[PDB]
Design a protein around this ligand. Structure first.
Ligand code: HEM
Ligand code: HEM
Lengths: 341, 346
């Protein structure tokens, strides 16, 4: 059966096996009272449990389910929730009395020299990561979740992505043709995931069992890359394209990252969205998503090192950025982020 | 294996089993000499045959100072029933009053821009095109890899006009797929396994220039679907829009329900559409989604245009939809082994 458990010590969709498709939405809270947010997450919890477990009538009422996934398998559907800095303090105002529960490292990522950030393509009070092996299943889940948020939230953006693994289980390849994900530690090793991803202490209690999610929308210049020689492509990463093996002003991508001595859990997706109206070429890139218990220690040093000397900067540009705090898992009978009181 | 034959009496991707994902691109020809077009389709034929089959680009002793012949992101993927369908729009034969490449005598009978409809809101940049490429596969990464490498060969001869992409998931037990309104979509289609019906609805046998023999016409309509308005409507209003029950699809007895209004024309087409999403619409703040309506018919004047006239006038579905792009293409007959696509370019 293609069912991933929703309840647990941790949220699914983080160490869960990498599905093929993602829908990534961010929302801004427009409700005034925290009680409205409680109702939203209570209904989101009930709906998510129904959608992920495989669960499938008044004619005068609108359909509670939009119905386009009625005959489809759950397809390993997972839904992951997180909170941005604006959820705790907006324009200097503590809107829901949550200042005492703000995570240690929850803040907007520092500016980088080569950034070209669109403010409308990043940030957000709440993030929803919807993953499934079937895009129609993934969109159906996000669509029905967002319909519940009417009156309390405004949808900020909706991104979608794909990533296909090898037919025999090989490491998936990004849009540059290189194997992507080899540097990750095994998600099946609880000891390694507890040291890299999961939070055990030092944070507010609702973060116990949670993690931080970093989001970077990275445009990839496909037309420039495809015109480059194989040598230039392999020199950009410092790895052979087919095998991924190491061979041997700017530094190769992979060795530059390792020089920081830090580790994160990358769980990214490729994306394509028609022709870019300003360039006339395919609009494509990477929905970079990573999980780490401490972004200040693990993730920001990578941004600093790459933003300075990465040869990959010639073929990429970050246009959106966000950092979210993901709560711990939901116990059966509880709702997501129940430390909203 | 998930391999669909590229060569044949007909092009694949028309009566072929409906794959899950599509990339739909249109291109405008900027080259002046017909010889440049011949080279383009000769290379497209070679590349498509490789992509659709299990063949992979082996450049073992390649030159590292040359660009890779293949972009490489499908190296470890199965063909995933990849099909590539080519077609020609009216602009391929006449642009700004000029008879292009001396092909006026081979222009198909019914190849012309679709007539304007009252409820149309057509963006000229979201329709038309001299050449269409429909790339379908059960794996989106396989489909995009095919389109990307096909478009890379067109540099110098064509400019890409638009690239659309879509999805459509069939039931786990083979049930008819459901569109984004939750209704089963495709029941009205005749069986693609019935050669007699496909010959009467889709395939051209005579009456057209020889290169159209074994081909068909492809109609394209980009139809935005108002999900937020639809989702706030009652189930009865949703079912009254189509005249069919939502779960079962069963029929039940100025606005006319969609299906009975279509049936009143007495015509048949082969619908092969895909749903689409592109994030939030910057103009509405809601999800930008709809249907990439793709249909195949041997005579669009007889089979398809009467449907457009009937629907644009009385369709209750017009309350929840709006067409924003339109195009008509003439698809050549199949390519025989040893030939190249539409080789009636001489
Ligand atoms: C378009 C953007 C990017 C592309 C195409 C890309 C591609 C790659 C590739 C091919 C590898 C080697 C294989 C692997 O381990 O995955 C790699 C390694 C890695 N990259 Fe990137 N990357 C991108 C952006 C980033 C960013 C923005 C970060 C961090 C802020 C990052 C962090 C890492 C890490 C941690 C590794 C593993 C290094 C190790 O072996 O320990 N990547 N990347
Ligand atoms: C967003 C746009 C549309 C949606 C959601 C839609 C949906 C449907 C549905 C649910 C059915 C009944 C089940 C089926 O037979 O597939 C149907 C029937 C049909 N529709 Fe549409 N439709 C759309 C646009 C169009 C357009 C623009 C045309 C033609 C110009 C068209 C032609 C047909 C045909 C030929 C049938 C089959 C009629 C029969 O039973 O013989 N559809 N459509």
């Amino acid at each position: 059966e293609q069912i991933v458990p929703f309840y647990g010590k941790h949220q699914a969709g983080i160490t869960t096996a990498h599905q093929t498709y993602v829908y990534f939405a961010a929302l801004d809270v427009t409700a005034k009272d925290k009680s409205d947010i409680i109702t939203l997450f209570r209904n989101w919890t009930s709906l998510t449990q129904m959608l992920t477990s495989g669960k499938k009538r008044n004619q005068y009422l609108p359909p509670q389910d939009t119905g386009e996934s009625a005959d489809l398998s759950p397809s390993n559907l997972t839904v992951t929730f997180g909170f941005g800095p604006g959820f705790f303090e907006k324009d200097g105002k503590d809107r829901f009395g949550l200042k005492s529960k703000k995570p240690k490292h929850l803040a907007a990522l520092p500016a980088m020299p080569n950034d070209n950030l669109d403010e409308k393509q990043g940030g957000g009070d709440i993030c929803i990561q919807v993953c499934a092996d079937d895009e129609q299943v993934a969109f159906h889940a996000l669509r029905n979740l967002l319909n519940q948020a009417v009156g309390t939230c405004e949808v900020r953006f909706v991104n979608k992505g794909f990533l296909s693994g090898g037919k025999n289980g090989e490491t998936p390849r990004n849009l540059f043709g290189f194997k992507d994900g080899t540097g990750n530690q095994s998600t099946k090793d609880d000891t390694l995931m507890n040291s890299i991803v999961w939070i055990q202490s030092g944070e507010p209690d609702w973060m116990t069992g949670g993690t931080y999610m970093a989001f970077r929308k990275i445009k990839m210049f496909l037309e420039v890359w495809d015109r480059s020689s194989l040598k230039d492509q392999e020199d950009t990463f410092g790895r052979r394209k087919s095998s991924g093996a190491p061979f041997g002003p700017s530094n190769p991508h992979v060795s530059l990252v390792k020089s920081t001595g830090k580790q994160i859990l990358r769980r990214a997706f490729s994306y394509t969205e028609g022709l870019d109206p300003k360039t006339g070429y395919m609009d494509a890139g990477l929905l970079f998503i990573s999980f780490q218990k401490n972004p200040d220690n693990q993730f920001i040093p990578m941004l600093k090192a790459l933003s300075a000397k990465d040869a990959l900067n010639e073929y990429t540009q970050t246009i959106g950025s966000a950092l979210y705090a993901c709560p711990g898992g939901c116990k059966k009978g509880e709702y997501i982020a129940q430390r909203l009181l």
